[PDB]
Amino acid sequence: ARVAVLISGTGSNLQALIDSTREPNSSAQIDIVISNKAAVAGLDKAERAGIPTRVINHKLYKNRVEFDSAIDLVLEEFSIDIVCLAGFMRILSGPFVQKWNGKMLNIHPSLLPSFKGSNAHEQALETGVTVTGCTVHFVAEDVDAGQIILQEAVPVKRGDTVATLSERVKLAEHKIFPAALQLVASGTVQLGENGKICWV
């Protein structure tokens, strides 16, 4: 499977995906990395790995549909089978999501359905859980609500900040995101007809 990774930041999830897709029995290859922001370290990481990049600045488009269409043009340009959202910070429109249904994965730093949204660590700390985690899910129109592929629990330590908890959860993300990509890229896991996760 030919894979696109969309990013908006540092790209530590991108990095773990690069490393894993290049291990010997991989069913996936990363052929493009697209950022919606310029000068993010995730772009340098892509280039240092010899992977093409594109910056599609979301602020240059009048609405979501048009920004998403520009992204889709690059995806078709590169003949992409699977899209991975790895720290990508834009909610995608219905038509984009519908087109990419069953072929787009996201990594989210909580155990869904808890702590949906972009500030999950802040929510976890405020709520006082002693256990949080991360989730790889298929992307649905409903934000952070698509079908769950993998999850990994991560403890919250007394006196954690957003930063310390965030780093602990990243360590788990770097394991399940590559394992989940490999599940989809091979036969193994698909979004079935009945809209549910199916293990072939």
PDB file of C-alpha atoms in Angstrom:
ATOM      1  CA  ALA A   1       0.000   0.000   0.000  1.00  0.00           C
ATOM      2  CA  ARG A   2       1.167   3.502  -0.903  1.00  0.00           C
ATOM      3  CA  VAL A   3       0.741   5.774   2.152  1.00  0.00           C
ATOM      4  CA  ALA A   4       0.336   9.533   2.708  1.00  0.00           C
ATOM      5  CA  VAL A   5       0.983  11.014   6.157  1.00  0.00           C
ATOM      6  CA  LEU A   6      -0.577  14.372   7.000  1.00  0.00           C
ATOM      7  CA  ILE A   7       1.058  16.435   9.727  1.00  0.00           C
ATOM      8  CA  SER A   8       0.809  19.874  11.360  1.00  0.00           C
ATOM      9  CA  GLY A   9       3.764  19.712  13.781  1.00  0.00           C
ATOM     10  CA  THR A  10       6.882  18.028  15.178  1.00  0.00           C
ATOM     11  CA  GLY A  11       6.260  14.691  13.430  1.00  0.00           C
ATOM     12  CA  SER A  12       7.301  12.141  16.042  1.00  0.00           C
ATOM     13  CA  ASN A  13       4.460   9.869  14.896  1.00  0.00           C
ATOM     14  CA  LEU A  14       5.571  10.413  11.308  1.00  0.00           C
ATOM     15  CA  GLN A  15       9.063   9.262  12.330  1.00  0.00           C
ATOM     16  CA  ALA A  16       7.897   5.990  13.919  1.00  0.00           C
ATOM     17  CA  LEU A  17       5.852   5.269  10.790  1.00  0.00           C
ATOM     18  CA  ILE A  18       8.894   5.883   8.558  1.00  0.00           C
ATOM     19  CA  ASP A  19      11.029   3.561  10.670  1.00  0.00           C
ATOM     20  CA  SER A  20       8.458   0.732  10.795  1.00  0.00           C
ATOM     21  CA  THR A  21       7.405   0.865   7.106  1.00  0.00           C
ATOM     22  CA  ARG A  22      11.034   0.264   6.198  1.00  0.00           C
ATOM     23  CA  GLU A  23      11.418  -2.923   8.266  1.00  0.00           C
ATOM     24  CA  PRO A  24      11.605  -6.010   6.022  1.00  0.00           C
ATOM     25  CA  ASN A  25       8.070  -7.461   6.029  1.00  0.00           C
ATOM     26  CA  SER A  26       6.131  -4.201   5.641  1.00  0.00           C
ATOM     27  CA  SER A  27       2.960  -3.904   3.520  1.00  0.00           C
ATOM     28  CA  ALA A  28       3.199  -0.135   3.425  1.00  0.00           C
ATOM     29  CA  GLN A  29       5.506   2.542   2.057  1.00  0.00           C
ATOM     30  CA  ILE A  30       5.374   6.294   2.778  1.00  0.00           C
ATOM     31  CA  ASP A  31       5.366   8.140  -0.560  1.00  0.00           C
ATOM     32  CA  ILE A  32       4.310  11.638   0.484  1.00  0.00           C
ATOM     33  CA  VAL A  33       4.110  13.808   3.582  1.00  0.00           C
ATOM     34  CA  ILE A  34       1.724  16.755   3.544  1.00  0.00           C
ATOM     35  CA  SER A  35       1.685  19.563   6.069  1.00  0.00           C
ATOM     36  CA  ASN A  36      -0.864  22.318   6.458  1.00  0.00           C
ATOM     37  CA  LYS A  37       1.829  24.477   8.164  1.00  0.00           C
ATOM     38  CA  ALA A  38       5.236  25.671   6.938  1.00  0.00           C
ATOM     39  CA  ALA A  39       8.481  25.280   8.916  1.00  0.00           C
ATOM     40  CA  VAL A  40       7.323  22.388  11.121  1.00  0.00           C
ATOM     41  CA  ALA A  41      10.003  19.842  12.083  1.00  0.00           C
ATOM     42  CA  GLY A  42       7.871  16.997  10.668  1.00  0.00           C
ATOM     43  CA  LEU A  43       8.774  18.298   7.190  1.00  0.00           C
ATOM     44  CA  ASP A  44      12.530  18.118   7.876  1.00  0.00           C
ATOM     45  CA  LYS A  45      12.103  14.546   9.133  1.00  0.00           C
ATOM     46  CA  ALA A  46      10.354  13.576   5.874  1.00  0.00           C
ATOM     47  CA  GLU A  47      13.062  15.171   3.723  1.00  0.00           C
ATOM     48  CA  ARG A  48      15.864  13.643   5.811  1.00  0.00           C
ATOM     49  CA  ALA A  49      14.211  10.240   5.118  1.00  0.00           C
ATOM     50  CA  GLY A  50      14.127  11.082   1.384  1.00  0.00           C
ATOM     51  CA  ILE A  51      10.329  11.392   1.238  1.00  0.00           C
ATOM     52  CA  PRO A  52       8.697  14.145  -0.864  1.00  0.00           C
ATOM     53  CA  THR A  53       6.763  16.890   0.948  1.00  0.00           C
ATOM     54  CA  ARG A  54       4.095  19.460   0.211  1.00  0.00           C
ATOM     55  CA  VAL A  55       2.833  22.364   2.242  1.00  0.00           C
ATOM     56  CA  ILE A  56      -0.828  23.088   1.587  1.00  0.00           C
ATOM     57  CA  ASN A  57      -1.548  26.137   3.689  1.00  0.00           C
ATOM     58  CA  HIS A  58      -5.193  25.822   4.811  1.00  0.00           C
ATOM     59  CA  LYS A  59      -5.399  29.616   5.294  1.00  0.00           C
ATOM     60  CA  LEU A  60      -5.162  30.135   1.493  1.00  0.00           C
ATOM     61  CA  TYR A  61      -8.571  28.525   0.829  1.00  0.00           C
ATOM     62  CA  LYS A  62     -12.018  30.008   1.412  1.00  0.00           C
ATOM     63  CA  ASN A  63     -13.483  26.874   3.006  1.00  0.00           C
ATOM     64  CA  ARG A  64     -12.762  23.299   4.089  1.00  0.00           C
ATOM     65  CA  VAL A  65     -13.974  21.541   0.925  1.00  0.00           C
ATOM     66  CA  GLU A  66     -11.512  23.470  -1.267  1.00  0.00           C
ATOM     67  CA  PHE A  67      -8.567  22.938   1.085  1.00  0.00           C
ATOM     68  CA  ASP A  68      -9.432  19.196   1.181  1.00  0.00           C
ATOM     69  CA  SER A  69      -9.677  19.088  -2.648  1.00  0.00           C
ATOM     70  CA  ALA A  70      -6.129  20.494  -2.952  1.00  0.00           C
ATOM     71  CA  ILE A  71      -5.013  17.702  -0.591  1.00  0.00           C
ATOM     72  CA  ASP A  72      -6.864  15.076  -2.636  1.00  0.00           C
ATOM     73  CA  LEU A  73      -5.150  16.281  -5.868  1.00  0.00           C
ATOM     74  CA  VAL A  74      -1.764  15.529  -4.284  1.00  0.00           C
ATOM     75  CA  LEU A  75      -3.059  12.141  -3.059  1.00  0.00           C
ATOM     76  CA  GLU A  76      -4.162  11.213  -6.622  1.00  0.00           C
ATOM     77  CA  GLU A  77      -0.885  12.692  -7.982  1.00  0.00           C
ATOM     78  CA  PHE A  78       0.917  10.191  -5.753  1.00  0.00           C
ATOM     79  CA  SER A  79      -1.469   7.288  -6.229  1.00  0.00           C
ATOM     80  CA  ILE A  80      -2.103   6.949  -2.481  1.00  0.00           C
ATOM     81  CA  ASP A  81      -3.951   3.899  -1.060  1.00  0.00           C
ATOM     82  CA  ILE A  82      -3.929   4.876   2.627  1.00  0.00           C
ATOM     83  CA  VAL A  83      -3.835   8.185   4.482  1.00  0.00           C
ATOM     84  CA  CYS A  84      -2.410   8.494   7.996  1.00  0.00           C
ATOM     85  CA  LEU A  85      -3.195  11.530  10.137  1.00  0.00           C
ATOM     86  CA  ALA A  86      -0.256  11.988  12.476  1.00  0.00           C
ATOM     87  CA  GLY A  87      -0.627  15.136  14.554  1.00  0.00           C
ATOM     88  CA  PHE A  88      -2.683  16.694  11.736  1.00  0.00           C
ATOM     89  CA  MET A  89      -4.820  19.468  13.196  1.00  0.00           C
ATOM     90  CA  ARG A  90      -7.556  20.180  10.609  1.00  0.00           C
ATOM     91  CA  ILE A  91     -11.032  18.655  10.760  1.00  0.00           C
ATOM     92  CA  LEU A  92     -11.733  17.237   7.283  1.00  0.00           C
ATOM     93  CA  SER A  93     -14.985  17.780   5.346  1.00  0.00           C
ATOM     94  CA  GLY A  94     -17.648  15.145   4.742  1.00  0.00           C
ATOM     95  CA  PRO A  95     -16.860  14.511   1.044  1.00  0.00           C
ATOM     96  CA  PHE A  96     -13.100  14.027   1.683  1.00  0.00           C
ATOM     97  CA  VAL A  97     -13.846  11.706   4.622  1.00  0.00           C
ATOM     98  CA  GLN A  98     -16.476   9.809   2.614  1.00  0.00           C
ATOM     99  CA  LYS A  99     -14.062   9.323  -0.315  1.00  0.00           C
ATOM    100  CA  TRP A 100     -11.299   8.092   2.006  1.00  0.00           C
ATOM    101  CA  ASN A 101     -13.645   5.910   4.134  1.00  0.00           C
ATOM    102  CA  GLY A 102     -11.843   2.772   5.329  1.00  0.00           C
ATOM    103  CA  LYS A 103      -8.514   4.084   4.032  1.00  0.00           C
ATOM    104  CA  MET A 104      -7.735   6.861   6.540  1.00  0.00           C
ATOM    105  CA  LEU A 105      -6.336   6.327  10.054  1.00  0.00           C
ATOM    106  CA  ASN A 106      -5.824   8.766  12.929  1.00  0.00           C
ATOM    107  CA  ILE A 107      -3.797   8.593  16.143  1.00  0.00           C
ATOM    108  CA  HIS A 108      -5.537  10.191  19.130  1.00  0.00           C
ATOM    109  CA  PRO A 109      -3.894  10.594  22.579  1.00  0.00           C
ATOM    110  CA  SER A 110      -6.720   9.185  24.721  1.00  0.00           C
ATOM    111  CA  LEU A 111      -8.647   5.956  25.208  1.00  0.00           C
ATOM    112  CA  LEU A 112     -11.699   6.847  23.070  1.00  0.00           C
ATOM    113  CA  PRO A 113     -14.467   7.465  23.714  1.00  0.00           C
ATOM    114  CA  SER A 114     -12.946   9.434  26.634  1.00  0.00           C
ATOM    115  CA  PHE A 115     -11.368  12.825  25.974  1.00  0.00           C
ATOM    116  CA  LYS A 116     -12.287  13.570  22.371  1.00  0.00           C
ATOM    117  CA  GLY A 117     -10.790  16.769  20.966  1.00  0.00           C
ATOM    118  CA  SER A 118      -7.273  18.240  20.593  1.00  0.00           C
ATOM    119  CA  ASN A 119      -6.535  18.863  24.300  1.00  0.00           C
ATOM    120  CA  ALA A 120      -6.973  15.302  25.603  1.00  0.00           C
ATOM    121  CA  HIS A 121      -4.110  15.457  28.128  1.00  0.00           C
ATOM    122  CA  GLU A 122      -5.527  18.643  29.603  1.00  0.00           C
ATOM    123  CA  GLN A 123      -8.913  16.885  29.917  1.00  0.00           C
ATOM    124  CA  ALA A 124      -7.346  13.774  31.466  1.00  0.00           C
ATOM    125  CA  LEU A 125      -5.401  15.757  34.064  1.00  0.00           C
ATOM    126  CA  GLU A 126      -8.447  17.844  34.973  1.00  0.00           C
ATOM    127  CA  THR A 127     -10.670  14.752  35.277  1.00  0.00           C
ATOM    128  CA  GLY A 128      -8.178  12.920  37.493  1.00  0.00           C
ATOM    129  CA  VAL A 129      -7.948   9.591  35.705  1.00  0.00           C
ATOM    130  CA  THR A 130      -4.998   7.398  36.758  1.00  0.00           C
ATOM    131  CA  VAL A 131      -5.170   5.611  33.401  1.00  0.00           C
ATOM    132  CA  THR A 132      -5.245   7.173  29.978  1.00  0.00           C
ATOM    133  CA  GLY A 133      -3.805   5.973  26.669  1.00  0.00           C
ATOM    134  CA  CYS A 134      -3.959   6.355  22.894  1.00  0.00           C
ATOM    135  CA  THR A 135      -6.169   5.141  20.065  1.00  0.00           C
ATOM    136  CA  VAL A 136      -5.760   4.478  16.373  1.00  0.00           C
ATOM    137  CA  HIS A 137      -9.106   4.734  14.626  1.00  0.00           C
ATOM    138  CA  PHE A 138     -10.554   4.917  11.143  1.00  0.00           C
ATOM    139  CA  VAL A 139     -11.575   8.495  10.440  1.00  0.00           C
ATOM    140  CA  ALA A 140     -15.302   9.189  10.356  1.00  0.00           C
ATOM    141  CA  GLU A 141     -17.052  12.535   9.802  1.00  0.00           C
ATOM    142  CA  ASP A 142     -17.865  12.599  13.502  1.00  0.00           C
ATOM    143  CA  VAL A 143     -14.612  13.823  15.079  1.00  0.00           C
ATOM    144  CA  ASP A 144     -12.649  11.221  17.087  1.00  0.00           C
ATOM    145  CA  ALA A 145     -15.570   8.792  16.696  1.00  0.00           C
ATOM    146  CA  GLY A 146     -14.554   6.465  13.843  1.00  0.00           C
ATOM    147  CA  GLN A 147     -14.065   2.745  14.384  1.00  0.00           C
ATOM    148  CA  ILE A 148     -11.312   1.738  16.790  1.00  0.00           C
ATOM    149  CA  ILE A 149      -8.407  -0.377  15.481  1.00  0.00           C
ATOM    150  CA  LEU A 150      -5.956  -0.465  18.410  1.00  0.00           C
ATOM    151  CA  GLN A 151      -5.575   1.125  21.835  1.00  0.00           C
ATOM    152  CA  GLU A 152      -2.879   1.094  24.531  1.00  0.00           C
ATOM    153  CA  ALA A 153      -3.339   2.114  28.143  1.00  0.00           C
ATOM    154  CA  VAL A 154      -0.790   4.461  29.753  1.00  0.00           C
ATOM    155  CA  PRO A 155      -0.630   5.359  33.481  1.00  0.00           C
ATOM    156  CA  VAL A 156      -0.967   8.916  34.755  1.00  0.00           C
ATOM    157  CA  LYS A 157       1.680   9.641  37.413  1.00  0.00           C
ATOM    158  CA  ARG A 158       1.037  11.895  40.405  1.00  0.00           C
ATOM    159  CA  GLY A 159       2.351  15.356  39.510  1.00  0.00           C
ATOM    160  CA  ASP A 160       2.215  14.869  35.730  1.00  0.00           C
ATOM    161  CA  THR A 161       1.963  17.939  33.537  1.00  0.00           C
ATOM    162  CA  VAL A 162       0.527  18.009  30.007  1.00  0.00           C
ATOM    163  CA  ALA A 163       4.148  17.734  28.817  1.00  0.00           C
ATOM    164  CA  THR A 164       5.198  14.704  30.922  1.00  0.00           C
ATOM    165  CA  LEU A 165       1.949  12.817  30.286  1.00  0.00           C
ATOM    166  CA  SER A 166       2.110  13.775  26.606  1.00  0.00           C
ATOM    167  CA  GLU A 167       5.603  12.255  26.277  1.00  0.00           C
ATOM    168  CA  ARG A 168       4.544   9.058  28.035  1.00  0.00           C
ATOM    169  CA  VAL A 169       1.535   8.657  25.711  1.00  0.00           C
ATOM    170  CA  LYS A 170       3.662   9.384  22.591  1.00  0.00           C
ATOM    171  CA  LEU A 171       5.818   6.345  23.488  1.00  0.00           C
ATOM    172  CA  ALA A 172       2.666   4.186  23.205  1.00  0.00           C
ATOM    173  CA  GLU A 173       1.507   6.007  20.051  1.00  0.00           C
ATOM    174  CA  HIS A 174       4.783   5.129  18.347  1.00  0.00           C
ATOM    175  CA  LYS A 175       3.934   1.429  18.878  1.00  0.00           C
ATOM    176  CA  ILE A 176       0.237   1.140  17.927  1.00  0.00           C
ATOM    177  CA  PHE A 177       0.171   3.571  15.023  1.00  0.00           C
ATOM    178  CA  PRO A 178       2.731   1.496  13.000  1.00  0.00           C
ATOM    179  CA  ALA A 179       1.108  -1.781  14.063  1.00  0.00           C
ATOM    180  CA  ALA A 180      -2.324  -0.466  12.956  1.00  0.00           C
ATOM    181  CA  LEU A 181      -1.050   0.797   9.601  1.00  0.00           C
ATOM    182  CA  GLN A 182       0.387  -2.681   9.007  1.00  0.00           C
ATOM    183  CA  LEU A 183      -2.984  -4.245   9.927  1.00  0.00           C
ATOM    184  CA  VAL A 184      -4.833  -2.131   7.341  1.00  0.00           C
ATOM    185  CA  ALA A 185      -2.096  -2.229   4.670  1.00  0.00           C
ATOM    186  CA  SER A 186      -2.028  -6.033   4.766  1.00  0.00           C
ATOM    187  CA  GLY A 187      -5.153  -8.147   4.501  1.00  0.00           C
ATOM    188  CA  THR A 188      -5.733  -8.018   8.165  1.00  0.00           C
ATOM    189  CA  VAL A 189      -8.210  -5.354   9.339  1.00  0.00           C
ATOM    190  CA  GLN A 190     -10.803  -3.478   7.308  1.00  0.00           C
ATOM    191  CA  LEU A 191     -13.875  -1.338   7.783  1.00  0.00           C
ATOM    192  CA  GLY A 192     -16.555  -3.894   6.839  1.00  0.00           C
ATOM    193  CA  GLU A 193     -19.835  -3.365   4.956  1.00  0.00           C
ATOM    194  CA  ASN A 194     -21.881  -3.005   8.170  1.00  0.00           C
ATOM    195  CA  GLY A 195     -19.668  -0.039   9.176  1.00  0.00           C
ATOM    196  CA  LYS A 196     -17.906  -2.168  11.809  1.00  0.00           C
ATOM    197  CA  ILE A 197     -14.286  -3.242  12.332  1.00  0.00           C
ATOM    198  CA  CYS A 198     -13.685  -6.603  10.714  1.00  0.00           C
ATOM    199  CA  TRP A 199     -10.686  -8.886  11.199  1.00  0.00           C
ATOM    200  CA  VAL A 200     -10.468 -10.992   8.020  1.00  0.00           C
TER     201      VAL A 200
END
